[model samples]
Target chain A: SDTTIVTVDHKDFDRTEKYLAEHFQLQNVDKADGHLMINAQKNYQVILKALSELDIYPKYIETR
Target chain B: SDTTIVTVDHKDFDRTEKYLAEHFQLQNVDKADGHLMINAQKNYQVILKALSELDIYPKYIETRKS
Candidate 1:
């Protein structure tokens, strides 16, 4: 299981989603309870670097 | 201008704040709108690395130079 599940505030979904779509393959993007959960079949650091560029960080990251 | 304002979910406040307090200076900690905003007078990378060690990431980070 190399996929990483990153969760961020709903307000940042659009930016994060677009950033991921441009840089990596977005496995899934879903929003619930005011939080946006993104599943990316990539390394957590890959996603972290991308988010850092946009000044957006995830509240949590779970590798699954 | 070296301060970084890192925001995290309220659920992570205690852990984040405690971690910062133990390792770095917690300049200010305030909660609003279900979010906890932490002001740390340290470089953003320093704060980010500390949080990463705890498996916690900030929702936002702002560095005020003005």
Candidate 2:
């Protein structure tokens, strides 16, 4: 078992950050660069469901 | 060696459907249901950019937590 760092990159920082924190770790928030790091404190769906309600979606990081 | 199926679901289906098909395989588009299945024909970023420009984000299929 290992811990994966999920790098969150999204616009509208305030709304997205506040919305997701309800059910996630939200390790840190970097407003200037438009990104954040989360460890999924409890659930990820909560993040999705939150973003969906706001008409926002999470774009996948391009790792390749 | 293989392809990944990226399921796309958004509030605005019509606008997104046409916008994405320009660069992706666009496997299937269900406008009625507001979802789609696409294969990254060019690059994943292309798909991401398309979605971003439309203010759409992909939600992960939750299975576990950290």
Most TM-score-accurate candidate: 1
Q: For model 2, what is the error of residue A11's alpha carbon versus the real structure, in angstroms, after optimal superposition?
A: 5.0
Return the interface RMSD of model 2: 6.2
lDDT tens digits by residue: candidate 1, B1-66? 455555676876788778766765567668663233344353244566666767676655555542
Q: How big is the positional error of residue A62 in model 1, measured in Å on the Cα after superposition?
A: 1.1
| Model 1 ranges with Cα > 4 A deviation | A33-43, B1-66
lDDT (tens digit, per residue) of candidate 2 on B1-66: 234344345565666667656765666555654556565332244454456566654442221111
lDDT of 1 at B37: 38
Model 1 scores what on Cα lDDT?
0.60
Question: For each prediction, how big is the interface RMSD?
Answer: 9.1, 6.2
Q: TM-score each candidate.
A: 0.45, 0.43
Query: By DockQ, who's the top model here?
Result: 2
Tell me how far the alpha carbon of residue B38 in candidate 1 is from the true structure, in angstroms, after superposition. 18
